[PDB]
Amino acid sequence: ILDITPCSFGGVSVITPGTNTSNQVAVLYQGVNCTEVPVA
Amino acid sequence: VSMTKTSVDCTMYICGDSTECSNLLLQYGSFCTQLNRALTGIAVEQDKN
Numbered sequence: 157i158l159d160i161t162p163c164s165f166g167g168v169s170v171i172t173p174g175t176n177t178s179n180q181v182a183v184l185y186q187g188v189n190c191t192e193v194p195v196a
Numbered sequence: 197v198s199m200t201k202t203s204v205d206c207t208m209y210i211c212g213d214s215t216e217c218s219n220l221l222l223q224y225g226s227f228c229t230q231l232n233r234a235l236t237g238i239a240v241e242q243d244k245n
C-alpha cells in the first residue's frame with residue numbers, strides 16, 4: 157500500500173512598502189516549510 | 197472575540213489541478229475572485245476584532 161499526499165501548495169502573499177518607496181519586495185508562502193521551495 | 201481565519205483556494209476547491217476544468221471555470225468570471233475576496237475580508241477583520 158502506497159498513500160497519496162497531494163503535491164504541496166499555498167497562498168502567496170507579497171510584502172511591499174509603497175512602490176512610491178521601492179520596487180524591492182519580500183514574499184510569503186503561506187503555511188509552507190519552504191525547504192521544498194528551492195527544490196522547486 | 198475572533199474565529200479561525202480561513203482562505204479557501206477557490207479554483208483548487210472547485211477542481212484541484214485540472215486545467216481542463218480551470219479553463220471552464222474561467223467562463224463564469226468574477227465569482228471565484230469575489231469568494232477569495234470575501235474570505236480574505238473576513239480573515240482581515242479578525243485582526244481588527
Ligand SMILES: *[C@@H]1O[C@H](CO)[C@@H](O[C@@H]2O[C@H](CO)[C@@H](O)[C@H](O)[C@H]2NC(C)=O)[C@H](O)[C@H]1NC(C)=O
Nearest residue numbers: 164185186187188189190191192193194195196
Ligand atoms: C521542515 O521540514 C523538515 C523535513 O523535511 C523537518 O525536519 C525534521 O526535523 C526533525 C526535528 O529536528 C528531525 O528529527 C528530522 O530528522 C528532520 N528531517 C529532515 C529531513 O531534516 C523540519 O523540522 C521542518 N521544520 C518546520 C519549522 O516545519
Ligand SMILES: *[C@@H]1O[C@H](CO)[C@@H](O)[C@H](O)[C@H]1NC(C)=O
Nearest residue numbers: 172173174175176177178179
Ligand atoms: C512619493 O513619496 C514622496 C515622499 O517620500 C512624496 O514627496 C511624493 O509626493 C510621493 N509621490 C507621489 C506620486 O505623490
